[PDB]
Amino acid sequence: VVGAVDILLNHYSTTMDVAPVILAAHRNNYEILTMLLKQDVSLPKPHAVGCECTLCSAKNKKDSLRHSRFRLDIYRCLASPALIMLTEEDPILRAFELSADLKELSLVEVEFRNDYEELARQCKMFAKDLLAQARNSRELEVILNHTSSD
């Protein structure tokens, strides 16, 4: 609604402190995300499938399904073009790296492969689109000859 989101702020459920952002990102709404991210937010980091401490073992014991859905939701958020644009210094590199991760996860989480793969393709497309916006060749050079390493 945007207007409504504004009003509410003016005054499933995989979480609640960050669920607004997680949903917005899924809603891929730049405006709403801009509003929400105004207040500092910190999505939890999806621990890798490898962990075995209660960190994950306990959860994977209480509710494996929820845990899995939770992680997918975090990634579905992190892989939102809007969020990458707003929060990442180098949007392209993030898309490259995240696409790689979302693929690995497809292999690991065989159950939700299609989901994790769609997200990967989404990231790949985003980067292509951002390149498509180049207009002169000076820009192309800056982009294709830049490194994130000192």
Place this chain on the structure above:
Amino acid sequence: DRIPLQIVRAETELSAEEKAFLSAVEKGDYATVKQALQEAEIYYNVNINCMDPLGRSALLIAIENENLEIMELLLNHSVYVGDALLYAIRKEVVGAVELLLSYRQFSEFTPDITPIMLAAHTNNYEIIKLLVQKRVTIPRPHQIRCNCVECVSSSEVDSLRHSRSRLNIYKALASPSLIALSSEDPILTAFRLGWELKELSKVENEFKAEYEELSQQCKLFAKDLLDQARSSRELEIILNHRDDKYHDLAKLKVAIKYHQKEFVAQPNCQQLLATLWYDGFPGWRRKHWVVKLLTCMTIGFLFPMLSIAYLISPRSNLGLFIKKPFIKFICHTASYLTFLFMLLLASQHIVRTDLHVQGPPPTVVEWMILPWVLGFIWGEIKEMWDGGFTEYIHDWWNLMDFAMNSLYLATISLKIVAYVKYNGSRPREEWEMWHPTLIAEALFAISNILSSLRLISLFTANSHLGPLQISLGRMLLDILKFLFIYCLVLLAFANGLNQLYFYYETRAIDEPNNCKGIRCEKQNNAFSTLFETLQSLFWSVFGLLNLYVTNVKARHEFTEFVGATMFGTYNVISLVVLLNMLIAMMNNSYQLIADHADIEWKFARTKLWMSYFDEGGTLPPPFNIRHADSLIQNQHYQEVIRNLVKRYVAAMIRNSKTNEGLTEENFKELKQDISSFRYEVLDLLG
């Protein structure tokens, strides 16, 4: 010249006043409509219940335009309301409430359709709920093939109606929303209904497609409800519910029974099963590729011990280890593999035996093979008994198992028989064609081939090979059909060829090297006999039949030419035409099968995993030596089901609102909204 055009089947025409009345309704001018009505009451100049060229009356026009204001006006003036409810239900609007509240020849609805049936057909949860709130009933369709009931003997009269009426009933009973609102166990109801509908698809040759579609609707509904699960606690409550032990994945088993593949393949469901399968191998799949191989190989090598431990101390660390499903699979496969290896040792004839001894004492390797054989037998026996013949009979591989085993039995019998009799030794050459030892060897060879090809079943456990195995099976059905046609052609040409060359058959002695047939250095007497002609034609398909076989020694040119021409036509029909056509057909199917490959494979894999999930299992070589509870369970299932249904209905609605285009009816509605609005404002301002 010119073709005059006239209205042949003429119908009464609307007077000018009546035309205006209906026109107002289409524009939503309450004022004019109201006035017209009032005047009609006085001067009786308009039949309030007049009809348009399309047969729509005023109330029907109002219903379609969805103008409840005008509808009320018309109803207050007591307009014929026949079938109006049905039209409203089809439009799926809240005008239904008004008509129901307003309670007390041409129709677009057959005489059988009832308010609830149509609501079900529309799948509008709200309208259905409204109707059900008031007593409503859908006739129970008689069981498939219920001739006993003379009522079914009504088919003699207006079968068309009978058939349509039945389909309408099922089309309603199979509405996701009705099943949701009415059925106590929505999932089980869908499973069952989807099966009955499939059966009907077969019995009712015509209307097959409809019944099949309705069946898929039911199947998908069940998967969709499962998809609305959010926690493992729910998923477990659903999949382990027994209608009436528990914790036996009862519902999953029912699904497998009703071939509910999509349900059994749902990601979350597959996840649970995996946890059960790889118990004891945390992240076995995650284990590095090699690591997996390592563990599997090691466990396999230790299969006899693990087996022995279970035999010794069921309640021991080792004894318990074999109970794990994945371990059983590893062991039960390693056992079979060793069996096959033993059979290979025979090839190399590691234990060589004289070719002259009739019925020799079973060789060393044989003895070793004997146990496994016996184990496999008893195994099949157990399956049959435990599962009942129907189920055992159903399994196709069971046929291969039965055949493989039977061959092994005969082999043994003959081996034995050849021992008691034919106890002496003679040059193999002297042995009669059907010497027991000879026949036994052949049977053994065939059995060995069958045994090794039984490994194909194991492919279902592999992510890569499995899907292929499943697809192949599906295609095989079609290949069989093609084979029947090929056979007919073969028989035809076989009869013909044999008919022409049988006059020129020659003796084996006459033939060089006393060899007669298509399998001699110089092929001869190929078409002399039907048996030989059939063989020759078969081998020709592979190009192993030389062309010189088409000439008769006496050299009768004409005959030979006809013979070669017949052989040639066969080659063209078989290789150039039929063979190629098979390619096209197989390409068509493979394409389709590919669409549903995963669900098929996963359904198959589950069945396999489930088999091991059970408790009655040891490798073949060592194979042969309170109502309160139910109440609670049901209560929980009902709670979960309630939530699942709730979240499902909502989802469906949301999807429709956001994933549906705007049709012309929508434009007409908006246009009416503005029109009626205009007229009102103008009247007020006027």
Place this chain on the structure above:
Amino acid sequence: DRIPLQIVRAETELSAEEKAFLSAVEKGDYATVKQALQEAEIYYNVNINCMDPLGRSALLIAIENENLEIMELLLNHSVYVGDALLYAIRKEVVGAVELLLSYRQFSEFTPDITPIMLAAHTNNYEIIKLLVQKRVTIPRPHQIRCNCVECVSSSEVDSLRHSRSRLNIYKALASPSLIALSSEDPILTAFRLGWELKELSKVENEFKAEYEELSQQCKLFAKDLLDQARSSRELEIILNHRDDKYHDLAKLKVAIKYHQKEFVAQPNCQQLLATLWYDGFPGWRRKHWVVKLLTCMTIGFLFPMLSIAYLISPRSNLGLFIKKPFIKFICHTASYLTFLFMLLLASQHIVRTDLHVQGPPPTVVEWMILPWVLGFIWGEIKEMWDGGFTEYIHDWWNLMDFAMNSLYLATISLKIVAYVKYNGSRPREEWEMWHPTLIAEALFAISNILSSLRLISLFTANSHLGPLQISLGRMLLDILKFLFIYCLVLLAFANGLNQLYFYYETRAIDEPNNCKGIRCEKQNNAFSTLFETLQSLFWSVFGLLNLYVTNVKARHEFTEFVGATMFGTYNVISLVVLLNMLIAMMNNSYQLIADHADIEWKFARTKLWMSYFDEGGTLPPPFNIRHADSLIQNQHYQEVIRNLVKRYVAAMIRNSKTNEGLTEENFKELKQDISSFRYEVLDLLG
């Protein structure tokens, strides 16, 4: 842990007042907007030229909602109008008139887009007409390979810009509307432009798809204008128009030159050609197939008669008959068939010539064949002369004609070289390998193959074989590509096997029956020489190479094994891998080809028919014995073009209106419309 989320693309936020102003524009509250504007003047609390985070300023927000009233209000006040015209053009509003009338970084439009270009890219006839009315110019796109101009040779400054800029001009020049409004011969320009765009697609590899899309756009436009023809008079005026005799189907010819296939295949165009083709046989379409057959047969049989009459007295009625195109085709086909029959007789005892007379005298049959051969060559010469090397060369079949004719010439030469220098009659077995007579016979036979294959060309004429011929030809291209891949495979294994067995070569003498090679009863030394290796591997594709060709005489097990493995791998790669792939590839190609076969076939047939429509035609055997007018013609063409363009513009609009869903933006406008009306009414009534 946690992943921090911070905004790095920091952006200023609009003041509440500002933000509010923008919201009012979106809702269409003229009043509030008006107030805000006035207050901002005096108070200066809101920059009227502020922007949304999405870069939507007020004027832009108004243009998109298409509220010209608010637009005027905003424009009246001093609101920056940068690039607004472009937005008003992209959206295709005619509120562009207002902006054009007013005249007092991070842009969504590249710095090169000028209003005229954008309008053209949108293809709005109206909007374009407005702008064009005012003097407007689109830069010339320097021709392909115009590197000479240092202007383009300075692309080093910014290539991407240069390339993009170039595409934008063409994307504009290739707009059907701009070509309708600004070009004198809309049809010719589209033909030419289509070609250039095609060529550019090739030179500019990147943007290939874009240029190709544009070319198709131009081709479709020309066809559509043609389809707007409503009388045969118009169709003639168009197809027979010469830009600069007339009445020669000039534009039809140019269309064939530029490969405007669709234009040529257009129903009407085809119909006209047909009438010209079947002149002399009106109703030939109605003629019963049998009747037709009869007519064709008679004419063909009498071909010599008709052929002569013309020569003697073209004016003679009979002379007139052969001039008709369809006739020419029939006569010319009969001549070819007669020729082919002559060739067949040559291989028979028709003349029963001796077979040991080295340098024999030409037989009667050969003598008769000579005239035809001469005619065919002469025809080719004329073709080259009357069509230029380019056209002749372009034709694929002219290649075969050349080959056939050249061989039928070398045959003659060698025959002569043999009549001389060979007066004896030595035994054929004594003749050397390259005896001229032997070489001559070989060439003649090869040509007889080519000659008989030329008949495939005639298929284009039939409505059934024609399309098939075309489709197959296209698929041949695909096969050719595959052969390249295979060739490398062949070469690899050829070299390997030769490198392994070349040591074990043996003299033919040693071999049985003094025969050395794959074409000997006992295939021997098949891999000893490279050439044999290539041939042997080639034949192995057809299973004509025996496996005993891989065993060295000395029986070196290792070498033989390596060889067999190499041969086997080749067979797997070629027969089981590449071959099966080719099949799949071809399957796909046919599916696609089949779709365009008709346009492809009709274009082909028209070229054939056109060939005969021309006046210079006699069968091969008897082959070798005003400014005023221009102005009027052009006026007529312009008249027809005016009508066609008008009809086209209207038709395209109708199609756009009747075939385009209501996008979301459309909805937004309606909502804004109601909103504005609401505010206005509320105020007046409040």
